[PDB]
Short mmCIF file of C-alpha atoms and ligand atoms in Angstrom, two decimals:
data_model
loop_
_atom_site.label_atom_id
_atom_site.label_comp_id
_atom_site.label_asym_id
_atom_site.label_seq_id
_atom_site.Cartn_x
_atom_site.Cartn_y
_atom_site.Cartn_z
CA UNK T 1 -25.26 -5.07 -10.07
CA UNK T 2 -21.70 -3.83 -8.23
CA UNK T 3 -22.92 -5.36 -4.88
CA UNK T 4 -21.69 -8.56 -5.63
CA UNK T 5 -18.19 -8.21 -7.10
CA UNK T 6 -17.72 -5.80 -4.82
CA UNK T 7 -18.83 -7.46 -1.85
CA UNK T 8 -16.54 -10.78 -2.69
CA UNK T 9 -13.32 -8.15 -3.10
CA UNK T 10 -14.09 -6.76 -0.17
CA UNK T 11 -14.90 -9.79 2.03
CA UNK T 12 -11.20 -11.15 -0.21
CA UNK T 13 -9.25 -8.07 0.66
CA UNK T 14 -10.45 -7.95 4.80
CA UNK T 15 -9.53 -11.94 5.27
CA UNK T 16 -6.25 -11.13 3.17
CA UNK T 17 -5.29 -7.80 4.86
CA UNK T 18 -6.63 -9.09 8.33
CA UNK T 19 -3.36 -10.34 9.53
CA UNK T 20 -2.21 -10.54 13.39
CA UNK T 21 1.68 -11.35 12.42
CA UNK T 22 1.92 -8.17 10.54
CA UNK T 23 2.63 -5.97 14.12
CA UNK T 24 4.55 -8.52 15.88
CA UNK T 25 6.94 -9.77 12.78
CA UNK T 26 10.07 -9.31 13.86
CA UNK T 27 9.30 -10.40 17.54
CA UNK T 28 8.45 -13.51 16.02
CA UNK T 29 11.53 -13.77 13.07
CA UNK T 30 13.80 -12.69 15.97
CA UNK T 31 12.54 -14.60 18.94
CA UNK T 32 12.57 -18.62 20.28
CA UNK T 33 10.86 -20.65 17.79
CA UNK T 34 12.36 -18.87 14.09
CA UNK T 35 15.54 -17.68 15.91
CA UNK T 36 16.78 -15.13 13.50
CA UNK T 37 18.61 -12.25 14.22
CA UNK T 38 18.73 -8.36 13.55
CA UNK T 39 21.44 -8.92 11.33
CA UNK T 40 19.96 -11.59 9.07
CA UNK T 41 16.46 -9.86 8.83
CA UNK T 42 17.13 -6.45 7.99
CA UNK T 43 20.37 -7.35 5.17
CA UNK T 44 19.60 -10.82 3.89
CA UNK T 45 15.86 -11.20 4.22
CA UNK T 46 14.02 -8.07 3.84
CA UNK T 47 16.21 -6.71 0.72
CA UNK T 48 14.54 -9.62 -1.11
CA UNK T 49 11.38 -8.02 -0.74
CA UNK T 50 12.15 -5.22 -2.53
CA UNK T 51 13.86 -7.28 -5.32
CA UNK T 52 10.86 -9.72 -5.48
CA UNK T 53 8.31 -6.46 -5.41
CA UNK T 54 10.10 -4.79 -8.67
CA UNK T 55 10.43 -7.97 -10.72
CA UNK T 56 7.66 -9.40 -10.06
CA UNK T 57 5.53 -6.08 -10.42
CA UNK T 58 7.00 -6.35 -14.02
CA UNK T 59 4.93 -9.27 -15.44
CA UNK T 60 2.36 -8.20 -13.09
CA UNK T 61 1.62 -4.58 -14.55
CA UNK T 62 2.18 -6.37 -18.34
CA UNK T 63 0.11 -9.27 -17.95
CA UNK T 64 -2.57 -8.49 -15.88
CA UNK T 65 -5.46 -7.01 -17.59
CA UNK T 66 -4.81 -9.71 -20.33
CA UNK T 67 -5.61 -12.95 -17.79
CA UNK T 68 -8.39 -10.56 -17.00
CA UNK T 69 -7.03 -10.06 -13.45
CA UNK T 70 -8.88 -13.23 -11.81
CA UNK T 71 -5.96 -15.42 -11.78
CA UNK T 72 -3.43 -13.00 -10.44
CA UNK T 73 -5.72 -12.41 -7.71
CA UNK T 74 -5.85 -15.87 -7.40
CA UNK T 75 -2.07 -16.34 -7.47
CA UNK T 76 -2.40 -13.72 -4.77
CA UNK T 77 -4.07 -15.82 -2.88
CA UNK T 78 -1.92 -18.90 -3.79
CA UNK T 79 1.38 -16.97 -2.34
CA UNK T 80 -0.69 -15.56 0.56
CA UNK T 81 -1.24 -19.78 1.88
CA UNK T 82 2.49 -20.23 0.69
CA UNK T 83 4.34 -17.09 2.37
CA UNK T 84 2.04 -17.96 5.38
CA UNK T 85 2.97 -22.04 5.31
CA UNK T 86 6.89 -20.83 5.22
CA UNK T 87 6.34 -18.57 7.69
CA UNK T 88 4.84 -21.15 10.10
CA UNK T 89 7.19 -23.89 8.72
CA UNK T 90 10.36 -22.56 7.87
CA UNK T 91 13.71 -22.51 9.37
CA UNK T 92 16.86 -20.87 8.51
CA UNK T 93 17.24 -17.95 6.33
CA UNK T 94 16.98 -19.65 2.77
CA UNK T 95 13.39 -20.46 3.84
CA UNK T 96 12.62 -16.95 4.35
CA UNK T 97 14.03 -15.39 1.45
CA UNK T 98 11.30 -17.61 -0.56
CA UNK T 99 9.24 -16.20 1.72
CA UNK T 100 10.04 -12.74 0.73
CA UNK T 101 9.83 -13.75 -2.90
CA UNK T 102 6.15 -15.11 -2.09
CA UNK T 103 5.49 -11.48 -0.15
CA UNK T 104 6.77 -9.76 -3.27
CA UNK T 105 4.08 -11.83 -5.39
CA UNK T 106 1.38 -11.23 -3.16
CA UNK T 107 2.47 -7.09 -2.93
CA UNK T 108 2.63 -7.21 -6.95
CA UNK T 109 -0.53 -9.18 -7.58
CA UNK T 110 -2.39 -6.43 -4.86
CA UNK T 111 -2.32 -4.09 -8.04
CA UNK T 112 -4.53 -6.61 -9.81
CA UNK T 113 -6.39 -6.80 -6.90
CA UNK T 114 -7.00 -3.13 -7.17
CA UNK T 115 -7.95 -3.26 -10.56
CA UNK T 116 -9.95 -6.40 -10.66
CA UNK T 117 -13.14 -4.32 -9.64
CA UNK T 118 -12.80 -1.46 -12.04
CA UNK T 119 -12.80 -4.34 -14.45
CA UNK T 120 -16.23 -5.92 -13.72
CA UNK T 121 -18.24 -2.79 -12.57
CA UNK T 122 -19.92 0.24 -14.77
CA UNK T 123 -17.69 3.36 -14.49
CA UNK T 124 -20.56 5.47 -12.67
CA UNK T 125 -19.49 3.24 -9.35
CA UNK T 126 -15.80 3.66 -9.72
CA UNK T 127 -16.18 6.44 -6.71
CA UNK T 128 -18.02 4.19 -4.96
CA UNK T 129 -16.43 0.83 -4.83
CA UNK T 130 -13.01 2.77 -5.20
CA UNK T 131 -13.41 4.06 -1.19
CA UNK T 132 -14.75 0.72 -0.62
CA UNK T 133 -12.12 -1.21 -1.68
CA UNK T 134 -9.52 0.96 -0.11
CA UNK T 135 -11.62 1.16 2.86
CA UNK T 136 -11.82 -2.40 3.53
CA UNK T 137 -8.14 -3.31 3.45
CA UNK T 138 -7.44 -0.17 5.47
CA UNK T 139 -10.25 -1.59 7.94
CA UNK T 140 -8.84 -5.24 7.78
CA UNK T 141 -5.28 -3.90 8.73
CA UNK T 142 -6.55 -1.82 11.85
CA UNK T 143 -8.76 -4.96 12.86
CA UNK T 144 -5.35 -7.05 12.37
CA UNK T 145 -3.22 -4.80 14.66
CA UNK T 146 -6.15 -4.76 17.01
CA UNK T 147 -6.76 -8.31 16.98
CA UNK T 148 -3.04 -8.67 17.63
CA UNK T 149 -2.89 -6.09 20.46
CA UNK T 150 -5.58 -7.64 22.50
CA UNK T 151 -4.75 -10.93 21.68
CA UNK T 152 -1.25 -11.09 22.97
CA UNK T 153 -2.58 -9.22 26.10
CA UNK T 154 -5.52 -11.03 26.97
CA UNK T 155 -5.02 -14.57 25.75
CA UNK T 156 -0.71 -14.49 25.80
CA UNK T 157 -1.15 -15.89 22.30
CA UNK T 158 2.34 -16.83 21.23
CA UNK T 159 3.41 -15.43 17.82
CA UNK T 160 2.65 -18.98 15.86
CA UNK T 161 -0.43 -19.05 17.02
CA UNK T 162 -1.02 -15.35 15.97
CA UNK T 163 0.48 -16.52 12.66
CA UNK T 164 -1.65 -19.70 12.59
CA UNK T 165 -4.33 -17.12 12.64
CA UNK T 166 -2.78 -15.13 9.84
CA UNK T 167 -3.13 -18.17 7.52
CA UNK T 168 -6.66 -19.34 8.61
CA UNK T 169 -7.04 -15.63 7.49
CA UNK T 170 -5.58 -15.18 4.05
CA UNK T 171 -6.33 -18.97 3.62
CA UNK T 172 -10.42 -18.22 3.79
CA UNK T 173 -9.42 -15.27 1.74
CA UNK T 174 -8.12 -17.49 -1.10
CA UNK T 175 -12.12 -19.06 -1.10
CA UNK T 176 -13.23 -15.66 -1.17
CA UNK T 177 -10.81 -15.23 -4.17
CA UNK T 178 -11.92 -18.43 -5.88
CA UNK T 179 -15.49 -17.01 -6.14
CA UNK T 180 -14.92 -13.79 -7.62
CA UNK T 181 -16.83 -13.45 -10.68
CA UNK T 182 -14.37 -13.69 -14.08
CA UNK T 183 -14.50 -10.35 -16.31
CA UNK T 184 -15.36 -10.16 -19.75
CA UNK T 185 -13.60 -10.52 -22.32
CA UNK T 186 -11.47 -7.44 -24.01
CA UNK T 187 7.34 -5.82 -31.09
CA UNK T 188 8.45 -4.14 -27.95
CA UNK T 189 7.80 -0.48 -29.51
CA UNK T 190 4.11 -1.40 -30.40
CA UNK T 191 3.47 -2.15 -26.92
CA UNK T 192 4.82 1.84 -26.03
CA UNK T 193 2.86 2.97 -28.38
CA UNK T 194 -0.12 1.94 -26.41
CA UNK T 195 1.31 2.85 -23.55
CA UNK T 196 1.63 6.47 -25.14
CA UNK T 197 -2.46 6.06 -26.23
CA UNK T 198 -2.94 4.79 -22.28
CA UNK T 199 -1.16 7.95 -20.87
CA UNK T 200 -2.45 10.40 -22.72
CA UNK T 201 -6.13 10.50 -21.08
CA UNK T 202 -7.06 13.35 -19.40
CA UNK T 203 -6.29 14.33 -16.14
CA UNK T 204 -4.33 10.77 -15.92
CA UNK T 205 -0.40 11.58 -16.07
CA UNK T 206 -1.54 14.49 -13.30
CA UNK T 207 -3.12 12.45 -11.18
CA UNK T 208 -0.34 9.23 -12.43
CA UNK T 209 2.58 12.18 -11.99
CA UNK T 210 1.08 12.47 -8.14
CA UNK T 211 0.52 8.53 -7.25
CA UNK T 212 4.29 7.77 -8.38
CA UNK T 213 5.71 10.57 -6.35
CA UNK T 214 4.02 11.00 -3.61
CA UNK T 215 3.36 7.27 -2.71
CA UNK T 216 7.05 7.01 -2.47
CA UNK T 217 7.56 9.55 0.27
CA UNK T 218 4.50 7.71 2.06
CA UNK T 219 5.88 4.69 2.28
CA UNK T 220 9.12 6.12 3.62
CA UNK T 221 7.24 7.68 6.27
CA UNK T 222 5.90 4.40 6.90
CA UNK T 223 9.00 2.68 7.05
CA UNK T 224 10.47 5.44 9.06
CA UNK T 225 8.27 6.57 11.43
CA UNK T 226 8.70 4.27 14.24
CA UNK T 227 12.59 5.13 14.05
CA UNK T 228 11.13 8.23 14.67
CA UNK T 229 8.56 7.47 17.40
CA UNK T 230 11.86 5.76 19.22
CA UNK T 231 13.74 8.55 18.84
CA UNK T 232 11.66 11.26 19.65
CA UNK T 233 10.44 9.04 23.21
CA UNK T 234 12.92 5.94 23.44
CA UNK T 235 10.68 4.15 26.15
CA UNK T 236 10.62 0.23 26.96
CA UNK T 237 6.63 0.69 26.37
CA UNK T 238 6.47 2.18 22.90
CA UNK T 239 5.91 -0.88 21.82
CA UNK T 240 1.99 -0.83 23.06
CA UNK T 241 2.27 2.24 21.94
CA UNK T 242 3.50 2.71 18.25
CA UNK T 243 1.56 -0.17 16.72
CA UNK T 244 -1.63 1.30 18.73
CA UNK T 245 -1.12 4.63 17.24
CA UNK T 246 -1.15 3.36 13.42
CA UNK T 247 -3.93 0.96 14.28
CA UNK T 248 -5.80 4.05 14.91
CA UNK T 249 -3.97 6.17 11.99
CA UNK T 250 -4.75 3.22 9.32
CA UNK T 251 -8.48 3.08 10.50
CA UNK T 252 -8.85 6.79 10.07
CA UNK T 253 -7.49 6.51 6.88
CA UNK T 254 -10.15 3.90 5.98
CA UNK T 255 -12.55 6.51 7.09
CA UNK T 256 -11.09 8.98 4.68
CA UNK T 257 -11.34 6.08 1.69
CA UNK T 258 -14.62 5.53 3.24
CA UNK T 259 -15.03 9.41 2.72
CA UNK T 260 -14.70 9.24 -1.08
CA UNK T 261 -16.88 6.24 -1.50
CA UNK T 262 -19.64 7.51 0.16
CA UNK T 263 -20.54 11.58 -0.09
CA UNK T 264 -21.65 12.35 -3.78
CA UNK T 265 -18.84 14.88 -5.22
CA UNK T 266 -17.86 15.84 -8.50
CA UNK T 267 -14.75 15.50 -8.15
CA UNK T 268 -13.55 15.96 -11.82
CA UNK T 269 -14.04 19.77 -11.20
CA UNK T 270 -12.66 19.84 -7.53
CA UNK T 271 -10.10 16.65 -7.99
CA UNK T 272 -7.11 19.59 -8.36
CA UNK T 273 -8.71 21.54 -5.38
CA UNK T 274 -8.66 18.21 -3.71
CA UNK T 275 -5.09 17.27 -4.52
CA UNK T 276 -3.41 20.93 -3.86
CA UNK T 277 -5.31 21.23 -0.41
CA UNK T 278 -4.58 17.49 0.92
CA UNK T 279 -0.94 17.67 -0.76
CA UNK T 280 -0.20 20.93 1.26
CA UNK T 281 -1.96 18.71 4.30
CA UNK T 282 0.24 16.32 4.13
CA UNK T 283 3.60 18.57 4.21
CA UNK T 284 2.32 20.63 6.87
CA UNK T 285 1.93 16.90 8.75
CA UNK T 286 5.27 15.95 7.94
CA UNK T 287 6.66 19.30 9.17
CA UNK T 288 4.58 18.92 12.14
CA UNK T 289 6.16 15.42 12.43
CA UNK T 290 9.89 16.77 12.90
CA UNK T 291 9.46 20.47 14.53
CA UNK T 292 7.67 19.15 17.30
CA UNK T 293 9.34 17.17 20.25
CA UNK T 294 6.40 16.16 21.21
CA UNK T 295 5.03 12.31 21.21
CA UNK T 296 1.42 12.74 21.18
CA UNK T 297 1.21 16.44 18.77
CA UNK T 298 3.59 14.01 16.41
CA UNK T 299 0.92 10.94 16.98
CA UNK T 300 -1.42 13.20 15.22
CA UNK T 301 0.44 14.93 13.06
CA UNK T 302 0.60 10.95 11.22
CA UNK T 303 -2.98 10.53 11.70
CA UNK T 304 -3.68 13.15 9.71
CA UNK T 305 -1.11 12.56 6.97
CA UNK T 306 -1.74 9.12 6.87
CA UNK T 307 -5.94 9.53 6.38
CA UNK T 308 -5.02 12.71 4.07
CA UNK T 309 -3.00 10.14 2.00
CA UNK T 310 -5.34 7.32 1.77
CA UNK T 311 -8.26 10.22 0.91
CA UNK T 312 -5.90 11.45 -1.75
CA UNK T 313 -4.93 7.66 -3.10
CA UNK T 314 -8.44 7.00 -3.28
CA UNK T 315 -9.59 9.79 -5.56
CA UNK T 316 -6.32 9.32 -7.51
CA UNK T 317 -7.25 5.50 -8.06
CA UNK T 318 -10.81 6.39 -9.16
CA UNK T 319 -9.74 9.64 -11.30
CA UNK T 320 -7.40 7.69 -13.21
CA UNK T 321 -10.43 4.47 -13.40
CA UNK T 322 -12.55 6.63 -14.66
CA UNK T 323 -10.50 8.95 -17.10
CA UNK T 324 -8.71 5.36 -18.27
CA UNK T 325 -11.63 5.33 -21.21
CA UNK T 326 -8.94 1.73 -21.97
CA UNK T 327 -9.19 -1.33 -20.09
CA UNK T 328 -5.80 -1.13 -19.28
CA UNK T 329 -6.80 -0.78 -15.62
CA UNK T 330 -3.70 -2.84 -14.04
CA UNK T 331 -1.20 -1.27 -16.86
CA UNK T 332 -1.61 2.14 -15.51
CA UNK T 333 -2.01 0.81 -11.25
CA UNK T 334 1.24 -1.40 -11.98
CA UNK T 335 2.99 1.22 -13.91
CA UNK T 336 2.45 3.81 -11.00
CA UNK T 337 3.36 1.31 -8.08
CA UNK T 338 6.62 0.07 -9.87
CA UNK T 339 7.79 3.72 -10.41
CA UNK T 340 6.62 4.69 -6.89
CA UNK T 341 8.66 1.71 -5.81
CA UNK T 342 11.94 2.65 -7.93
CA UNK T 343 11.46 6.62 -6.89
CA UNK T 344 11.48 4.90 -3.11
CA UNK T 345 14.60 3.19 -3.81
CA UNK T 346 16.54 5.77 -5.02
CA UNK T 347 15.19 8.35 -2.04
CA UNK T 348 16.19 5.42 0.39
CA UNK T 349 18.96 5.24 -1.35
CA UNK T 350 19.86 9.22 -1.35
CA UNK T 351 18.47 9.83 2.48
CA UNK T 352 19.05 7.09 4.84
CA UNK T 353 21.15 4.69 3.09
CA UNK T 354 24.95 4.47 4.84
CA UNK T 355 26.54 5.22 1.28
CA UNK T 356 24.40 8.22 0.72
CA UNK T 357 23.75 11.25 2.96
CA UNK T 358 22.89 9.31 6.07
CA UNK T 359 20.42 11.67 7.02
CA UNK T 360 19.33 10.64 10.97
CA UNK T 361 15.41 10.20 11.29
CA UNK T 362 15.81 13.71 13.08
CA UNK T 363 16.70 15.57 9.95
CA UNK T 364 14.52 12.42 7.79
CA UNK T 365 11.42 13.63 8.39
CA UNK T 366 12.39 16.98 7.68
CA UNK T 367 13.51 16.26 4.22
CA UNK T 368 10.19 14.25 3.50
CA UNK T 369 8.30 17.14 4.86
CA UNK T 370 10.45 19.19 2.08
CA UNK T 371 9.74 16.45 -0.33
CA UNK T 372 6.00 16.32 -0.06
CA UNK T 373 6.01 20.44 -0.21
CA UNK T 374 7.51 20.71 -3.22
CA UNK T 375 4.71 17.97 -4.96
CA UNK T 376 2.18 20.11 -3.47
CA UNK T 377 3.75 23.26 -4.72
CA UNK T 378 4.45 21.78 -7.85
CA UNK T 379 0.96 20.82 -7.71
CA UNK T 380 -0.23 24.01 -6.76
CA UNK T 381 1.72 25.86 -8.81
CA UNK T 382 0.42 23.86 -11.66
CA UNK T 383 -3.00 25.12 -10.69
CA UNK T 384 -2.25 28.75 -11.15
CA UNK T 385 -0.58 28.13 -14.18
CA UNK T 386 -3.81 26.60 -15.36
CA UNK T 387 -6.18 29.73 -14.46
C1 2TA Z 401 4.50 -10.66 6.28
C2 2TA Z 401 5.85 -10.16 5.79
C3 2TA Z 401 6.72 -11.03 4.94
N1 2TA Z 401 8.00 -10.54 4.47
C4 2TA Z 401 8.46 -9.17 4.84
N2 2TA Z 401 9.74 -8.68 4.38
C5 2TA Z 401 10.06 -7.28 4.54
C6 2TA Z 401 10.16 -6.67 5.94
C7 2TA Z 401 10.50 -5.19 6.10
C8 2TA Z 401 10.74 -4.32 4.88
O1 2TA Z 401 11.05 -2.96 5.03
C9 2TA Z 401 12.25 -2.58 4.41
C10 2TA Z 401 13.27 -2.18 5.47
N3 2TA Z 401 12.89 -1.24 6.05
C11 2TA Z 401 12.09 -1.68 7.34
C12 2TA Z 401 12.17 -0.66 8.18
C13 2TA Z 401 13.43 0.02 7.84
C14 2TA Z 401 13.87 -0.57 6.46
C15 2TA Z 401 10.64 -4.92 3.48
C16 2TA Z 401 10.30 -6.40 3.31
N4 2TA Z 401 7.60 -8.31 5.69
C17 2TA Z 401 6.32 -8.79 6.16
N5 2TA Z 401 5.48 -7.93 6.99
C18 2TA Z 401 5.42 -6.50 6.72
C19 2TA Z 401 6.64 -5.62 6.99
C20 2TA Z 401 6.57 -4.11 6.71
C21 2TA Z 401 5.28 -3.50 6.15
C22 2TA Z 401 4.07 -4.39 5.87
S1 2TA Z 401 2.54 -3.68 5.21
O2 2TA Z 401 1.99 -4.50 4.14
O3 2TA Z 401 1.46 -3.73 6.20
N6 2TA Z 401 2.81 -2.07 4.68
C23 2TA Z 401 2.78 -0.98 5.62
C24 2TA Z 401 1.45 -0.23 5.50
C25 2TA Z 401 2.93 -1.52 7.04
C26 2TA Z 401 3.93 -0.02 5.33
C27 2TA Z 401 4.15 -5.89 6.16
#
């Protein structure tokens, strides 16, 4: 049945998420043993990440569903030992823009990790298996972050070891990966022309027309909310602190994936209810997020955006699995992460970036709060105009 598949994706996507480096990165690229600095990191390493993510994402979201999504999972798992090898290994920062590009192949190939599933199970546990999946990751992260935050202060685990960790991690998830089951079988213009037959299911470039925009704004929120958390409370301590605070807003997310997978809810009739109530959810979060001078009221004003998200993702995920009817389930995942990715980089771009507005993370939040209102109203205006 969907145990099985679902069980080796899961166990895959815990061992590949559950990673103790993740918190503690840049203490350990900026620190005694990689000695980097905050120059290098943030203008000649991490850029490549982003270049790496939208290539690569581009062979990724074409070629996916026809390799049957096994072996980009397994190429996933490939880059995870690689990235993980540099990163334990590597020296200088030529070493660790490879290691970006490997990062960028194993963010790509996590759409055909998303999609794998929906290719090997029966549509009437996409709900299911959808929180699941989400779930697991989510949980694997939290578990990560927690097994870095004790670690570190009850074993004083240097950051290799944490990383050596990280890669007996990922590297038991690339067994995991090796035994996933392998799915069945089945010019440029052509190719549109099935993307225009892909698109046009129902309920798919709504729920699509959400996951590309507001996916954006969440991961600028979660590249920019401990610049916020530093400004609002600049303390020598945050440092417990922040990391703590999404290992316990990541986790309740998981809950909220776990929320979809688990109650019994038609939610093709209540998916827009759904969408317009959580959307509005998350901009009164973000607007919660800035108003506030307050640490702790802002602490959970990102819990709750952050598990309102993940809900949200998850039922977008399994609307658009189910309403695919094609088996084009990487096409549409990969397709919806690269333009999430590009609508990032042009917000980045517009909002933060030195060239553009070089809006402060005071008045940042505010304009993603103002971002995510007008999707919901757009959203919810969409609603009305239906009835
Ligand atoms: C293991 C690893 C290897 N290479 C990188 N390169 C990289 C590091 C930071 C990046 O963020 C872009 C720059 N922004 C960072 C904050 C302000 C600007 C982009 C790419 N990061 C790594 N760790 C990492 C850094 C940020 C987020 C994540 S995540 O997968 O867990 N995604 C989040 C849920 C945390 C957002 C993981």
């Amino acid at each position: 049945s969907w145990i099985y598949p679902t069980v080796i994706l899961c166990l895959f996507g815990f061992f590949s998420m559950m990673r103790p480096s993740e918190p503690f990165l840049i203490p350990y690229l900026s620190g005694p043993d990689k000695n980097l600095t905050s120059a290098e990191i943030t203008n000649e390493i991490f850029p490549v990440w982003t270049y790496s993510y939208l290539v690569l994402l581009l062979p990724v979201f074409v070629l996916t569903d026809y390799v049957r999504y096994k072996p980009v999972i397994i190429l996933q798992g490939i880059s995870f030992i690689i990235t993980w090898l540099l990163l334990l290994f590597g020296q200088g920062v030529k070493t660790m823009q490879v290691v970006e590009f490997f990062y960028g192949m194993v963010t790509a190939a996590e759409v055909a990790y998303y999609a794998y599933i929906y290719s090997v199970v029966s549509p009437e546990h996409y709900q299911r298996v959808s929180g699941y999946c989400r779930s697991v990751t989510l949980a694997a992260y939290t578990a990560g972050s927690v097994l870095a935050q004790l670690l570190v202060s009850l074993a004083n685990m240097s950051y290799f070891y944490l990383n050596v960790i990280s890669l007996a991690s990922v590297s038991v998830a690339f067994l995991f990966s090796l035994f996933l089951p392998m799915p069945k079988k089945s010019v440029f213009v052509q190719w549109f022309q099935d993307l225009k037959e892909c698109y046009s299911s129902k309920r798919l470039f709504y729920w699509s027309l959400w996951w590309a925009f507001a996916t954006a704004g969440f991961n600028q929120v979660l590249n920019y909310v401990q610049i916020l958390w530093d400004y609002k409370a600049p303390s020598q301590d945050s440092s417990i602190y922040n990391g703590a605070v999404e290992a316990i807003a990541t986790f309740g997310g998981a809950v909220a994936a776990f929320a979809v997978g688990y109650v019994k809810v038609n939610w093709d009739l209540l998916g827009e209810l759904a969408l317009v109530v959580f959307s509005v959810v998350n901009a009164g979060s973000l607007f919660l997020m800035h108003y506030t001078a307050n640490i702790w009221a802002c602490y959970a004003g990102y819990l709750i955006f952050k598990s309102s998200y993940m809900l949200l993702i998850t039922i977008a995920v399994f609307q658009i699995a189910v309403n695919l009817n094609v088996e084009r389930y990487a096409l549409v995942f990969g397709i919806n992460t690269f333009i999430a990715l590009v609508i990032q980089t042009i917000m980045t771009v517009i909002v933060v970036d030195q060239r553009g507005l070089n809006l402060p993370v005071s008045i940042q939040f505010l304009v993603y709060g103002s971002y995510f209102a007008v999707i919901a109203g757009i959203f919810l205006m969409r609603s009305m105009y239906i009835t």
